[PDB]
A paper describes a structure:
The family of poly(ADP-ribose) polymerase (PARP) enzymes plays a critical role in the detection and repair of DNA damage. The PARP enzymes share a common catalytic domain, in which an ADP-ribose moiety from NAD+ is transferred onto acceptor nuclear proteins, such as histones and PARP itself. Here, we present the structures of the catalytic domain of human PARP1 and PARP2 (catPARP1 and catPARP2) in complex with BMN 673, the most potent PARP inhibitor reported to date.
The crystal structures of catPARP1 bound to BMN 673 were solved and refined to 2.35 Å resolution. BMN 673 binds in the catPARP1 nicotinamide-binding pocket via extensive hydrogen-bonding and π-stacking interactions. The binding interactions of BMN 673 with catPARP1 can be broadly delineated into two parts: (i) conserved interactions formed at the pocket base with the nicotin­amide-like moiety of the inhibitor and (i) unique interactions formed at the outer edges of the pocket with the novel di-branched scaffold of the inhibitor. Also located on the N-terminal helical bundle, the PARP2-specific Ser328 is near the fluorophenyl substituent of BMN 673; in PARP1, the highly flexible Gln759 with multiple side-chain configurations occupies the corresponding position.
Numbering used by the authors: 662 to 722, 726 to 744, 748 to 780, 786 to 1010
Write the structure that this text describes.
């Protein structure tokens, strides 16, 4: 029997849920026979990324695109008439599929490679996880952040916080050290599919590989965060059939922000800048900022930023070095769909 709190045990089950892994693969139309969880290979996936990059290029300028489509389906067997990879959104969906596959492989490997099994798998995450007491001020601050920064245009659901966890990944403090005293450190959201979280906890937030198409990345390949909970929660890809999601709060060392109103695929920041801020029309009210253990929490309700000429409804924040993030909390959220 495990010594871990029930909420933590429930999180471990959730994150190592093999059935969720398989359901995801069925929804992607992957052939589970020909490409089982244990068989996923880093080198095949890398080659698949490159083919998707060639596809995107061929689309941007009918026979050759059929052949590339087929080369992709040979590398990543599907179980379908096979849809042509002939537009940016289709390509993007396959890239996101490959990302999700990669983290699923990580989860499956950890799982397969005397004590209660929940405890054995907990240890494999190499992450200290503690429950934040529902009645603490810490929890209250976090619930406020969730409540106040739900955007008015994300009306498909409300959020309810079920559990709040405090997390410390092995090695992250040391890795974050050079950034620990950069100025402008902010507690920001990052949402991702549940089936990615074993990978995220064991390896941290990562940046897309060189081989991946840049298409879809408004500010280039980086790690993206929001100051509005719902903007991030949308990337949980929850649904009525699976309405429980996981979302992170990260301390992000933003330093001097390169403020942008429109897409720009950053390959190198201007010297002296440490992050990108995509400027939204709505921003959390600066007067309501609260410090939490030295870090600003922009938990104000949304007001007008005064920026009209922008591509974005809400802010986003991007860093280009994985060491500029120190993960602090993990929330289990129930999405109540309307
Ligand atoms: C899909 N994805 N994969 C890695 N990162 C993400 C997204 C993202 N994930 N999670 C967040 O919380 C987030 C919060 C934002 F303000 C903005 C975000 C994100 N945009 C990122 C984005 C969107 C489309 C795209 F093609 C590439 C990147």
């Amino acid at each position: 029997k495990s010594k871990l709190p029930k909420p933590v045990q429930d999180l471990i089950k959730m994150i190592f849920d093999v059935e969720s892994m398989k359901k995801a693969m069925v929804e992607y139309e992957i052939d589970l026979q020909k490409m089982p969880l244990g068989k996923l290979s880093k080198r095949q996936i890398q080659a698949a990324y490159s083919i998707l990059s060639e596809v995107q290029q061929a689309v941007s300028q009918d026979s050759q695109i059929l052949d590339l489509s087929n080369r992709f389906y040979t590398l990543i067997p599907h179980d379908f008439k096979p849809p042509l990879l002939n537009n940016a959104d289709s390509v993007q969906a396959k890239v996101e599929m490959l990302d999700n596959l990669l983290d699923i492989e990580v989860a499956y490997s950890l799982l397969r490679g005397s004590k209660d099994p929940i405890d054995v798998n907990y240890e494999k995450l190499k992450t200290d996880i503690k429950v934040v007491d529902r009645d603490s001020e810490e929890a209250e601050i976090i619930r406020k952040y969730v409540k106040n920064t739900h955007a008015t245009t994300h009306n498909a659901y409300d959020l309810e916080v079920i559990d709040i966890f405090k997390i410390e990944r092995e090695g992250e403090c040391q890795r974050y050290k050079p950034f620990k005293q950069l100025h402008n450190r902010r507690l920001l959201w990052h949402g991702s599919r549940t089936t990615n979280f074993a990978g995220i906890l064991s390896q941290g937030l990562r940046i897309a590989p060189p081989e991946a198409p840049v298409t879809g990345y408004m500010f280039g390949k980086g790690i993206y965060f929001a100051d509005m909970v719902s903007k991030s929660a949308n990337y949980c890809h929850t649904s009525q059939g699976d309405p429980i999601g996981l979302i992170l709060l990260g301390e992000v060392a933003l330093g001097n922000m390169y403020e942008l109103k429109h897409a720009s695929h950053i390959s190198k920041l201007p010297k002296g800048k440490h992050s990108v801020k995509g400027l939204g029309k709505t921003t959390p009210d600066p007067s309501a900022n609260i410090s939490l253990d030295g870090v600003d929490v922009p938990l104000g309700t949304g007001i007008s930023s005064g920026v009209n000429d922008t591509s974005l409804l809400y802010n986003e924040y991007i860093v280009y070095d994985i060491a500029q993030v120190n993960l602090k909390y993990l929330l289990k959220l129930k999405f109540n769909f309307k």
